[model samples]
Target: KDQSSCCDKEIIKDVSELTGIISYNTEVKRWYISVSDANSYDNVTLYFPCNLDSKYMKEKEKVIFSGQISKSTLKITLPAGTTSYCINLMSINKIN
Candidate 1:
């Protein structure tokens, strides 16, 4: 009975929580990313969702989207090769 639920997963609030990404981009109102924590040198594809414009951002680029994180979901795995993630901005007003 020690199995944790999805609601109990660890939450990464900000960039200080992650780094070493290969590439990242924004949708109309969200963030999409694929990263390598150790050493990955592949051309990863960025996905822009329904009616969202493609972000002209590059990997290793310091991107600032100006939106704050109110809620997020992470699908994490053991350090096999890389980690892919998606974040939804709660709103905009602060320097995030």
Candidate 2:
């Protein structure tokens, strides 16, 4: 078979390597991340476990979270017993 087994492994490793440049406050037990270029119009995506779903998926075509980004960081209050989460930045691009 010419199929390589390393493909799956490599993809898994890449996803695992995805680091959250943020930390959860144990005292408050909340999640926070620092985003350098965050704008009010910019869309932010947060991925949680398979079972977890965001209640505010579409609010004026934007996912609204009970969190705020301060000083290039996003502070969010997560649900109880959240194992993992991921954040992504979204925006429109202009073709030159």
Candidate 3:
């Protein structure tokens, strides 16, 4: 359980440009980042820590973020249904 074990974790570094910034949910301590992919839905939410520096992340700026995806999934259960996502964000920065 050391830095050497980094190889055991999933690497999540994205070159994709950001679309928008949803909001900062203080209750959840999450900064919602708007993103998209080829998934069934055109829009998706990527969560970053609320404590993260705000300068590097804005509403319409491309960024290169890197982090360990980890060996677990984030599960959210609502009255409507249940959803699961694997979210791990270690570091982030602007593209230019």
Candidate 4:
């Protein structure tokens, strides 16, 4: 007789932001996002309200900028003139 084991995979969605850290640089005319986990995820997709343009905003995808994970923070540079933005993190599970 033979037996097999099955593993389950899950997709977790974690959304968060850093308060009082996001500021606009009038000198540079850009918005600086000092998120703690800006570079924490292997993959990240950022979304903005009303389709705002920024230096960090990438093309081919909707508000998604390909980024690398470093330490526990992810720093994002965006153009100024927006009131707010949204960050989304998606994590997938793999079984061996």
What local lDDT score does residue 61 receive in model 1, on the 0 to 100 scale?
46
lDDT of 2 by residue, 1-96 (tens): 233321111212112222223333465444433222254444333332221133322222222222211121234554443322332322112112
lDDT of 3: 0.44
lDDT per residue for candidate 3 within 1-96, as digits (tens), equals 143223333645432333434454455444545455546453454544323566754555565554443332434332332221233444566555
lDDT: which is higher, 2 or 4? 4
Q: What shift in Å separates residue 22 of candidate 4 from its native position after superposition?
A: 1.8
lDDT of each: 0.32, 0.29, 0.44, 0.29
Q: What is the lDDT of residue 34 in candidate 2?
A: 25
Give the alpha carbon lDDT tens digit for every residue of 1-96 in model 1.
243222222434433323222243333333344333344465342221122134423444433232112222433332443334334322212112
How much is 1 displaced in model 4, in angstroms?
Answer: 42
Error of 1 at 72 (Å): 3.4
What's each prediction's TM-score? 0.26, 0.19, 0.40, 0.20
> Which residue pairs come into collision in candidate 1?
none
Best by TM-score: 3
Poorly placed runs, candidate 4 (over 4 Å): 1-20, 35-66, 69-96
Q: Which is the better candidate, 1 or 3, if ranked by TM-score? A: 3
Cα misplacement distance, residue 87 of candidate 1 (Å): 3.7
lDDT preference between candidates 3 and 4, better one: 3
Residue 60's lDDT within candidate 3 is 56
Model 2 residue pairs with clashes: 33-74, 34-73, 35-72
- Residue 57's lDDT within candidate 2 is 25
Give the candidate order by descending lDDT: 3, 1, 4, 2
